[PDB]
Amino acid sequence: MAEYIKYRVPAKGVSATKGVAELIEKAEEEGIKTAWHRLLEQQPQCAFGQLGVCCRNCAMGPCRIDPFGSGPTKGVCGAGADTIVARNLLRMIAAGAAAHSDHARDVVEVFKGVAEGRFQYYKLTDVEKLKSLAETLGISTEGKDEHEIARELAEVLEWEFGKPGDEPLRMLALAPKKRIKVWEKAGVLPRAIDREVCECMHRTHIGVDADPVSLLLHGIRTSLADGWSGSMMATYLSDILFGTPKPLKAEANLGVLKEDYVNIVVHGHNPILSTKIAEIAMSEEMQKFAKKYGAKGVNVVGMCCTGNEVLMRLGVPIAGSFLMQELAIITGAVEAIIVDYQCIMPAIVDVAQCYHTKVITTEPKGHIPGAVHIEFNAEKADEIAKEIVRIAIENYPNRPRDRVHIPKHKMEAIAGFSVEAIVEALGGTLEPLINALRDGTIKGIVGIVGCNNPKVKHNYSHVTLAKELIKRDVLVVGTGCWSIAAAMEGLMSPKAVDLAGPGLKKICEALNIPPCLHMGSCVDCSRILIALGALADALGVDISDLPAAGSAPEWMSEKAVSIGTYFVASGVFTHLGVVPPVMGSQKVAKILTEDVEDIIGGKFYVEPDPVKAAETIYNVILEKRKKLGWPL
Amino acid sequence: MAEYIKYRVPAKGVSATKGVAELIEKAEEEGIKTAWHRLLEQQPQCAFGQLGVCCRNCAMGPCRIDPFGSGPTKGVCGAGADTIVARNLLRMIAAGAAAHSDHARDVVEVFKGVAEGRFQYYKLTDVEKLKSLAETLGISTEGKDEHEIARELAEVLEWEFGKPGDEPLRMLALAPKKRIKVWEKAGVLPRAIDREVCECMHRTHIGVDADPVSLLLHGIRTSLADGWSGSMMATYLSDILFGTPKPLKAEANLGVLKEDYVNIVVHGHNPILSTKIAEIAMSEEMQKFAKKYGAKGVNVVGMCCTGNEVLMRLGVPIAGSFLMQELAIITGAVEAIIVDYQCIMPAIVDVAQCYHTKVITTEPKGHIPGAVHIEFNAEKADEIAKEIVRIAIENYPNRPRDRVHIPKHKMEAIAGFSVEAIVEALGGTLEPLINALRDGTIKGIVGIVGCNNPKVKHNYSHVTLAKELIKRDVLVVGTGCWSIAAAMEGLMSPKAVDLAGPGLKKICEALNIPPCLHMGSCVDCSRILIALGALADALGVDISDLPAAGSAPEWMSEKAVSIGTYFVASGVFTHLGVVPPVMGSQKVAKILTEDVEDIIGGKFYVEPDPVKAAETIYNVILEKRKKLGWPL
Numbered sequence A, B: 001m002a003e004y005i006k007y008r009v010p011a012k013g014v015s016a017t018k019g020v021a022e023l024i025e026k027a028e029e030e031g032i033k034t035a036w037h038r039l040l041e042q043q044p045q046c047a048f049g050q051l052g053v054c055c056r057n058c059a060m061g062p063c064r065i066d067p068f069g070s071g072p073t074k075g076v077c078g079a080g081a082d083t084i085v086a087r088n089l090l091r092m093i094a095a096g097a098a099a100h101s102d103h104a105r106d107v108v109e110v111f112k113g114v115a116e117g118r119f120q121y122y123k124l125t126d127v128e129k130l131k132s133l134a135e136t137l138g139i140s141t142e143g144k145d146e147h148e149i150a151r152e153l154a155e156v157l158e159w160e161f162g163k164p165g166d167e168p169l170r171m172l173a174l175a176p177k178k179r180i181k182v183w184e185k186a187g188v189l190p191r192a193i194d195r196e197v198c199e200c201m202h203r204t205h206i207g208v209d210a211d212p213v214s215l216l217l218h219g220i221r222t223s224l225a226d227g228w229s230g231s232m233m234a235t236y237l238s239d240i241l242f243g244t245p246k247p248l249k250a251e252a253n254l255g256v257l258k259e260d261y262v263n264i265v266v267h268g269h270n271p272i273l274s275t276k277i278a279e280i281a282m283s284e285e286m287q288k289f290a291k292k293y294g295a296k297g298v299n300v301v302g303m304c305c306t307g308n309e310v311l312m313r314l315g316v317p318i319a320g321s322f323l324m325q326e327l328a329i330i331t332g333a334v335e336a337i338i339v340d341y342q343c344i345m346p347a348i349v350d351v352a353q354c355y356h357t358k359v360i361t362t363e364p365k366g367h368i369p370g371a372v373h374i375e376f377n378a379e380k381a382d383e384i385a386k387e388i389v390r391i392a393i394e395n396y397p398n399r400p401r402d403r404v405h406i407p408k409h410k411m412e413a414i415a416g417f418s419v420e421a422i423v424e425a426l427g428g429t430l431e432p433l434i435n436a437l438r439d440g441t442i443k444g445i446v447g448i449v450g451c452n453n454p455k456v457k458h459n460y461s462h463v464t465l466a467k468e469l470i471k472r473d474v475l476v477v478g479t480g481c482w483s484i485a486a487a488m489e490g491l492m493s494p495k496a497v498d499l500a501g502p503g504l505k506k507i508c509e510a511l512n513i514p515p516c517l518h519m520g521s522c523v524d525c526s527r528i529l530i531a532l533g534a535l536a537d538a539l540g541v542d543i544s545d546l547p548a549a550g551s552a553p554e555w556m557s558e559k560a561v562s563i564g565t566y567f568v569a570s571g572v573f574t575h576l577g578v579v580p581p582v583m584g585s586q587k588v589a590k591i592l593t594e595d596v597e598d599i600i601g602g603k604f605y606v607e608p609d610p611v612k613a614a615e616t617i618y619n620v621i622l623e624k625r626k627k628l629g630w631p632l
């Protein structure tokens, strides 16, 4: 059962959100390893892999390149350090784009089934978004039923994954003509998403593409296939199926788990499952079932991006971010955690085996040995959701109440700020915020996104960067676990305006919004690309000229690499708070942080310090203001 | 210029083909590093990577799993050794399938351009193959022009890469119904190739698929998308465009390079380029151009799989296999080496910079820094080929004749044994070879394929396994660098029958074929799958019941991993002569070499010794004979 913890985690400085330390210590006293303990067990981590100068692409390896110059400078094949670093980064981009593309593909399948009248458990709820998106891609809407429009749109979207021509992706019709011309001159226009992923897997194959420039340019093309198509399709279809998010209020942090209620966690990414689970479990049938089993009711909380989806659409309380999933089971009050795929730590099974908690996997692509697999499908969605919630409610009597410790800490957060909601907040036009940017009332906008990584202090960089930006009158928007961190800290509560500078304070009180805008999940970074795209278009300007920046302060996933790359390729200066494994090559490092600005108009900037990164981002914003002839 | 060689390669036992030792020593005395020297510089290679128990799939890594049990047993995410090994192998399968799929995609593009009447430099030469393949996939041929049939076929083939349904790949119509039912029960039927590659990249993403069984089953599905579709399309369309190979004779080994002729090497994989280069350079215009430049003419030789393509179709002499590419430049007589993609050592540029040799890259996916890029396209194919051959001929005067050493060693080889050619050799029916298998005149058939790897003796396992099999009356067929090795040794010369056993000797003299059948390039392993598929179907039998085996004695590429996996999945016992990086996990090792036989009917078997592997393969063949009620 219990395990010997070899190295203990100094808990008082491990995290920036209240409750994480208590639960790490509870795990220690129970002998349960978390991600921090295993990170400590991994150290020292291999320097060659950390710098990206180790390749395992063929059986003649593994090969190490010594950047000291002490030992070997070339692999068995002859690959230098530049080639190996660029290829490994290309495969990271491929994997992130692939994750987002499979997400989009599942939502496309459900949307097409609804267009044909097959999945009657799912609606076309935003017919306006459907018609406008169909018109944007060249589909006439008038004279047609909603479902026929949806059928034609679905046919085009299905084809985004594998169309055979060298014509650009259809969804690129959402990108401004300036970005279009930039990508055309650079030759990075994506053609079909799965083809881009497969071509990266081919280029990195031994003896194919050894040039860092071409490798990274195709990485740019693949990231664009992700952001402006795959993730974009995911967001647009999730809005069409479950509603475009509008501003609402909810609760954040692990204080949302209840003592006298069945606690059901929804963890993962695809809302096709989580929306059904939440609606079924907060239905009154399951409420009285839980009362029959000795509870006051059923409380469903969310974690990570599927939690963000249910938070933005239904107001479901979000319990925590990435590195907190384990900790949620260590509260001792989780009857069941329902997962689909992406960023589901396998360790959550181990942890769950020291309690009563059931780890329910539901998707054929997300298997974890030891879990209980109840496969979800669209046609019998409500029945599977009922069965799952029933299993959780029936496990409720097994909760070891003697080992329950839920941290009190709970925070209010205003979420649901899609681009449509933001434009509605401005009176239906972009003009007031544009005037605020031109005056200097708002210096700029910064999108903060990304994961958690135990190599940096938990959620510290997220919140510190957000604070330092909003205090300098910079409107902060963001997605993902950054948004979970900001919500748990209080940066999205109605009083968060207190920490903003004078101009941001005045405008947030003039529009009744917080100074930090939760724009949704990791695929909802596409929303950011729309927002900037609108701004740049309203000002007769490219995205690269906007006084704006992006940041991933604590990233860890290959999805984050794809997101940062397509931010750069979209022309936004993009900061990384975790050092990508590229420092083993000077050429690749300067391409990433320098040479690529001339090509597409954005670039990377590595800085693990949140305050330093805030100063650099603010200086870049001031530079873009000076280039725009604006006041500073 | 020259380099200090830190460790010298014992050349007298380095290889099994004559001439390799002399050229390794010439490289040493010139200070030019080959793959062997850099392999020596890499040792000791990291044990964790060698056993597959090191993962770099996220920024929380790199993570090592200690199979000793000394240190950490789980990664930061919680992934055990089984998960990490299975995921890394899945990405190898993804990369190999992707390489073969991009190859097929380029040939599909050219074939579709010819169907529309656009690339008039390319013909429909095998209209019979075109019509039969179109009928096999449900396209009626009668009443239609050749080009219209080709258009409909191309539409179906284009869709193999990205069709949106969960329906199986169309090309699976070439697989027997028994394999169909096996794959259906296992649930590994491939749907769309690029989707399979992208789904592997998604499953191996952090926190998605952690179960080794599901990971490896999707690897099986992806390998099937490669072998029975992508590689199959590549082979079928290459035959339709450039002719189905028929038996012919040619020369092998580095003795085919001439002293008084311009020497042009074609290296790579896609014949769209190499056929044009060979035809243009052996045209009389370039012959008199080379005479004007002081040479007797132009001699074009091939290396690796594109060399195998031009060898099977035109009789172009093949100069060597994988590990010999560098050595070909060290002869000092190569005016130009023309490469497209796949297994092009970047080091060949370095080596070429110590001579006059020009490394010409021609494909947008195959860039090598320092090379000269003359991009090839179908519409201006003949003009680009003329320009390239002219550059080689004009470089001829720069050959340092003082530093020229071409090994005399040259061997005759009978190549061009496609399935059609083999059936034509048997009188148009499969009955004589089936009778020979039933009698015991031929014990079985074994396909030998794969790469070269300097960790094992060069070409030694290829030739030794082929010899040990044919001496026990086992018909040896094979592709790729195994076929180059067999051709250079003499196992495909008319006298090779001398080394065969009595039954194989009698039947090869009765049909005037060698005991070793060159069936083409790495994609032409699809031919093998057809052959077995025919045999199994003629006997009313599954492929798994045939007295047959496959082997990759010296593999190194991820393409080889995909090929071996889809051989296994096709039901053939498949031997590996190089240990895959899986031994860090007992569960994955037993799935690969044991548990998977119950699922699909084949399995892996690791044995780096060629004689041991020959005995095991022969015993498995005898087992399959006993199960068939045949004599032993």
Ligand code: SF4
Residues within 6 Å of the ligand: A055, A056, A057, A058, A059, A060, A061, A062, A063, A075, A076, A077, A078, A079, A084, A205, A206, A207
């Ligand atoms: S691709 Fe080259 S550098 Fe990478 S492992 Fe293979 S031989 Fe070594």
Ligand code: SF4
Residues within 6 Å of the ligand: B055, B056, B057, B058, B059, B060, B061, B062, B063, B075, B076, B077, B078, B079, B084, B205, B206, B207
């Ligand atoms: S996926 Fe897991 S095992 Fe692999 S590097 Fe990431 S944290 Fe370590």
Ligand code: FES
Residues within 6 Å of the ligand: A046, A047, A048, A049, A050, A054, A055, A062, A064, B046, B049, B054, B056, B062
């Ligand atoms: S030697 Fe450490 S990542 Fe390969």
Ligand code: FES
Residues within 6 Å of the ligand: A046, A049, A054, A056, A062, B046, B047, B048, B049, B050, B054, B055, B062, B064
């Ligand atoms: S530690 Fe050697 S392959 Fe990663």
